[model samples]
Target: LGSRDYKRKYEFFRRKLKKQNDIPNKFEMKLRRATVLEDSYRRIMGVKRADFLKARLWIEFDGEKGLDYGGVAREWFFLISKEMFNPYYGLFEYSATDNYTLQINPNSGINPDHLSYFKFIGRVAGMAVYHGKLLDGFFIRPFYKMMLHKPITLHDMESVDSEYYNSLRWILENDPTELDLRFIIDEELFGQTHQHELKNGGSEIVVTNKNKKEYIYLVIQWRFVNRIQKQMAAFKEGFFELIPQDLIKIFDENELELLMSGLGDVDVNDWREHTKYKNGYSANHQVIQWFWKAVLMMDSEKRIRLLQFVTGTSRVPMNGFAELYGSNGPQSFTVEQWGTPEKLPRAHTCFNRLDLPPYESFEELWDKLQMFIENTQG
Candidate 1:
């Protein structure tokens, strides 16, 4: 079983990588660079760099590049190819290769009929890669979410699937250890669900539904992860330490207690009591729940530091401590800077943003979140 598993994973990765070779060297290089950037992004955020390559490929071909001959035809082909190949990794391979080829040879001698085969290959590669990770994360998110007992959204599901898939892909490619891989697989198979909030524009609520709820949660979670990655990247790129203390603080003792006690019990009701009354009503319950649950899982000392920062009442006073050390103790920062507590936009705005790839802008993220919150509350 162990050998077989290893063989299967290796072959899967090998085939996926091979598909990239068919593309023009320049496009292949672009895909590779995008993958590296994605890897860096994931690592900075303290996540496994799985599926970074595949996801990047998807974005490059399908996103702003618009090189995939308009998504309408590509998407249609993808669905059909998915049905035909049924490989663990879908047509990502063929899609990426053919897309690259198509871009290079806008009017190649190859017959239009040949394009179908390429699309099939890409679809199969994508399915294999994406579905494998998606299945893993789908199981994992629930385990964690269950521990957190927060309302889940479709968006949350997608985000978890994306992360898990990427993490799994990374592990398979770089560190294919039975123990480690199995651990990741198990985690992906059985993790907890963390809730998030979606807000509206200028505080106008939109429609309320489960699909909307999940979508908002997923985006917020992705934003949270992205923010962490950006901060870590800042530290790596510059000679500075940009540790995320707010996240740490939120996981402080009291917060931990709240999370521990609320695990399996925390729900929309809990969120209503915790922040809504004071902060205004919103459907950000799921996001808030996940945030708190993550806080509970942090190390105790980090939790203490986080607590002190939030309340501004550390046992070691900043002025005195700074004076003693001849340095400043700490400085205040906004949630936006730290990547926590992202501002969200209205519902329609969020839907629109999802249509775009590399949706990484803070302003756009805020709009989506705000819209969700407003829609949920209204």
Candidate 2:
């Protein structure tokens, strides 16, 4: 609005709220009648954003073919009120790369279920992405490290390496005047995707992979005893590098700490599994548990290789014991390298290789390394 008109409109709101008794002071009145004042202002001026009035929803499924044979013909608006659910297909639960938002697919249905040799999972009727105002408020877990914060900017959708946790913490902690400032939806960054939309419900619901890494990782994540996932875990490939909740079961004394204190820390919490061998040393570490179980079952060469991969170096000088972070050989995985998709494209043997052993289900630490190994060994 022009300055004079804006002032006049402000005065109108100022006078109108004075007439209302329940709303208390001018602050309360303004908060209550904000939309009405804006509505009147917008009416006086031409609708600057006429296009936004009409929101759209388009759903497409990947059955056998593609977007052509997928989803509905055009955008169809359903109850955006988001009682949104489906029994079969769930959500995309695992990933390392994401700064904008973590994801939950529209539908998580799987067809022809209860059987699979390969890890490739289900598909749904259709899949959808949305863009509109978030009538709903946003919420997130705690951010102890403020790298979770994002810096302020004039534009909404602009990408920034700025502090992510701090910005949101500021907004949520202090009641910001603009609630719209608090949502990715306001920036219209909610809807995203993989490149090809699966057809005939192929990509409509879910299409996973042969490796069970995501499944077990998600399984462990879900079952992990006291998993308090933080908001910081979604940004800049945070999934791969995040220090999740403590995995070790504690004793009477609270001062004790273990696990990542040892080998390739895979965020394994609340651990219980049938093992092939006798329990080894009493250090409360999942890798130790996995290791002790390994030497019991896996042959000598396999056991040796497992040790090599976990420690990031060939020689485990002592019996799977060494100061990993501060000592001799290759230690803990890189302290969260440049977290982005750009950090993904590795060519030569640059990535520190740590993947699952043959029969121990799947873990994602070294999927890139293992994938490279498999394709080449042929």
Candidate 3:
């Protein structure tokens, strides 16, 4: 299910060392809810890259009164991510998977500021990895390969666009003389058809037995490189601003994906075992027992929402529940008794503590828990 180990498999040591040497421990952003995409772009791009990497993030919604005790920053990430990846932006498109996974859109030029948008998204993604925040979405596998600067192949292409890969494969496997194909491709944009020549004199040169191989390579180049070169470079620049290319090269694409997105489904047993109970709440207490039962019975979606409500991000760290982090350092998920049964449960994300009310019944606790999680989202 994961990557094999080299000595560097313990790669988090490097990140820890990097954090210790970072400057200006606080990096703050004042953003607006309405124009989060533009505001985040301006604020993130305005910072010095070195400070941006290691400094703990402090987020404030413009004119909002609440302090950023981890939950606010997490909400900022979630909100802006929805804006950035929204299909209406036309910067990215859903891949063939149709699973909300995204890929670079070919017609990105339609947006005059598409390049800047790409760069902004890159920085936001880089920040997520650096700060231990999770984004609301994931990129296609090929996108991760590009981040690693790995060569993209037909197999990679197939993952995102199987029809495109299959057509290219058919061209290579069969004789090309009868088909009369050339090194020119046509793209339709806004009712106009444009032809792109793969190379000089490409439209005049025909694909034959000898030139078919060259034709296929050029096609791959045209699809992945020639079309999106500038956009990809801008994205890489924004990403590498925070993450040094050399440091991240230790990971291949699969490992990089795990690092960027984190593991799926919060392990209920692992979470229960790792959670610390405080203020007279213990493993055997009635309310504590009800809490675990409610969590265990939740659907994956609701479970994720519940985790996100308390912990800031739904995804767990690579080392399971034990590696969960808070504002200062290695903070475990903690449950403490606070208000009475009538009060709703609340969370202090900075300390990874949930202040659970000791409800009189399982149903009452469950209803209050769901209501709070559903309503409190910003």
Candidate 4:
């Protein structure tokens, strides 16, 4: 049930192997070790149902590599070990240098009882492979672009007018890091050299390593957007203009008392349930937590308006109103701007409207972008 118990079980199994002196029985040792490792891994990583399912698939499919059975066995062994031991998830199956290929049956049969174990293996293996490939692609490429080689930064700012220029400038000042620098080559776009586009439409910093044999691509875009948002939020009334008028009419005296009483008694389970709905008590709780102090210090109308905006409802429900708090109730609906592009008006609309400056090469743009991020962060 716990890590200590599992470790003791593993130790017991190890002692059995020693007592038997079965050094030549590699297959039996591998199977036992794999099982133990799988159990230990599941415990440490909190292997969920999804992870279990994927691991089953990987092991069931890995096939022999021509006459190199040793290589194939090693690959399989690594797949099992890496998935169980590596913190990152997924197993790598493809070799960029080798001409070898692997395939699996689409409709393979698996025992239902062992399905959970198989799935756990697959999940861990799959995540390890996925993350491994990402890291490899990021670091193994010649100049971040050699792997998936795409122009990510703006190339032609001259095509846009003054308004767009100002927007671009604002974005550069506020959110300089948004583009992904990883040279990720999608299998579908493997041969399509021109298809590689900028991440988030060129709103990111691209970093490349030049001196080394391999190039490393690092993404530094979202940080800029996040920093800018934080900066704007610091302004006294920056968010005021963004708040919709209709969202400010729910603050009657009766409503306030009901909301506060509910907050006082709400438990973690209740919070989880409330947070499940798109616009349930989760959003309401944020308003109370972040802006509650200001709300309390403000006038009656302001408090009511803030509550109404926070809840996105004219009729604010009491805290214990189960029907209103769950996904099936009125609380299920989110405000118009909850996940919409409108949530970030200046960044989304204005910054995105500009014509990007084009670079002659991805390498050039990548170097400059990396320098910019390092200078800013440092």
Candidate 5:
């Protein structure tokens, strides 16, 4: 259990360097990298100290039948893999609502290869290690025209008998305590923004804000496709876009209330009643929820100061990268001046913050995101 969480391992190694002039900081990093790498190989390739490593462990997000706490316990499940998946999209083009109807070959006992294990995890070693803390302000939400949560998996599939059923049985019957694999998991990387909006691009809901004055909007699209609305949602220009054929989401004042008290549920019918444009802000996706929890801990005045600490005019090198480039690079992406943060959390709870490996064209998809979450739920 101790080794299951990476943050704990990080702290364990970092502390050993407390007052020692001898143990260099990079030493701890090497150890951290080794920890994740070894686990990846052992779990993926299912081997240890061997000759050839045939590792192949991949991670993905599944929100359908998934839970996003407006307030309270919710039902949700995830679909991780040996290959990258279209978030909610079906191989037959999986979208938020409808996915594919994968069936086993009766004889093979396996569904027709879902999402073809392409864009395979090529190189193993991680790029320059990130010593970042929590990152958030992701005005991301699933709307159907609508969007549908993942239609639960083959939970006792109709009639087909596949080897996959054996795997599903473990999830349904085996006690969680009956650990077999070293598979450790964490919270998803989500962002919330004070400055944003969830536009009604489709139809299920004609969503809007106070005059719909855009505070800031961010749409996050991955391999996700929504079969429900025959639509898709993605990220572009720092905002989320929903395609019916067009898009997006951000925050509401009630957000803080939800974050602070956690007793009552939010009335979607009553959001953005009095949205103020001046202070609208966004953090990494779903992160603003936790940020407000920290803010409400202090006097209202201190709340403003705390915001100043992170988003104040003085906060710079936005998201840990110095924006001093003359023009975008060969990749045509802006050249960023990367350096360790002048401010790193002494420590914090690690939830849904795991980093995914780089994708084609550096499609961060996940690894690029970093942020903190709830004050340890205390």
Candidate 6:
């Protein structure tokens, strides 16, 4: 019943309206290149989250002339997310092998005032949802589960820490009497080894079939919940300040991920099918035909680049391209014939429109589109 299907789409869209209802005006924001995160945290933390939502977002770089027609704002979300979620900061870390997803760092307390940083991350995430912008980072499923107040079982650990999960799994299913383990965990952070007891006199309790289940439960709780409780609370505090927790709690973890990051893979057919052609260009026209052909031929990464080039984000809406929002309101992906064949394509992200020059040849169109998406920024 909780599938991410059309019903869920309608539910998300309906809730999205509640966020959009209060925002009718513009909130002008300006940031510098060198300190994007610091600048944003300072500015956003100073204002009321409601007031921030009441105004439409307009962003400008300190030195660049490019106005916030959605492109600059999208770039801001993308860039700031990249900086905050980087493993170098120690606030978040990548999951287990074969997945590059992010999860909150267990040792996040190592940073000074790390709880505030977590709060800031939550606010940025909330802003991204309110503004209909896709972030550059992806969080692990367990992180989303934490957000939804769901239980993180041993099965959930495999994605974040496979080796730890395997060890715990073995301890649960097999005899641990030979191992002679105690209900105490020793963790080494930096150069110091810290020990934690699962309960009162836990260190004296030996691991056996009788108490292994309780031990596993305590270990899982410590790793996923107890250790990160304060950080998660602060994050929730900031998140609920923007988006009401009751409203957001309707979504499951998977759907919450979609709300945060949207779909990663760009469906070419969905894009082409939903695109609107203008300036005497039709679906049957040679240039329009070539546009779809070129788009279809591009690889996934290049396709994402192309999507970002036009839409200011690599992701499409959960429903599809038809649900794209511009500065004005609901806007379609538009392709308009604007110039001679010699000119390169241009994107007006504010309107979700691509101004394409009708090149004489397919190769020319492909080369020009590729170059444009690759080189330019808002």
Winner of 4 and 5 under TM-score: 5
Superposition error at 3 for model 2 (Å): 64
Which regions of candidate 4 are displaced past 4 Å? 1-70, 75-119, 122-356, 359-364, 369-378
Per-candidate TM-scores read: 0.16, 0.16, 0.62, 0.16, 0.17, 0.63
List CA RMSD, all candidates: 24.9, 26.3, 16.9, 26.1, 24.5, 16.3
Cα lDDT, all candidates: 0.29, 0.24, 0.72, 0.27, 0.21, 0.73
Tens digits of per-residue lDDT for model 1 on 196-306? 233333123332332333334444445334323332222222211111222222232323222212212213223223321113222344443443444455444333333
- Which digits, one per residue and each the tens of the lDDT, describe model 5 over residues 1-378? 421232343344335312222322221011122243333333433323211221111121232232333111111001122112333323222211111212111122123432121101111211000111111111111221112222223322211222232433443454433332112110111122232223433222221332111211112111122221222221111011111112101111122211111212222212122111112233322333333333344343233222222221111123221221111111101111122333223210011011112122211221122221211211
Model 5 misplaced stretches (Cα beyond 4 Å)? 1-8, 11-111, 114-373
TM-score-superior candidate, 1 or 2: 2
Between candidates 1 and 3, the one scoring higher on lDDT is: 3
Clashes of 5: 49
Q: Put down candidate 3 lDDT per residue, 295-370, tens digits, no spaces.
A: 9997665676566556554456666788877644678889999988887888655566889888999999989988
Segments of candidate 3 deviating more than 4 angstroms: 1-10, 13-22, 48-50, 62-68, 159-162, 186-196, 266-378
Error of 4 at 337 (Å): 30
lDDT-based ranking: 6, 3, 1, 4, 2, 5
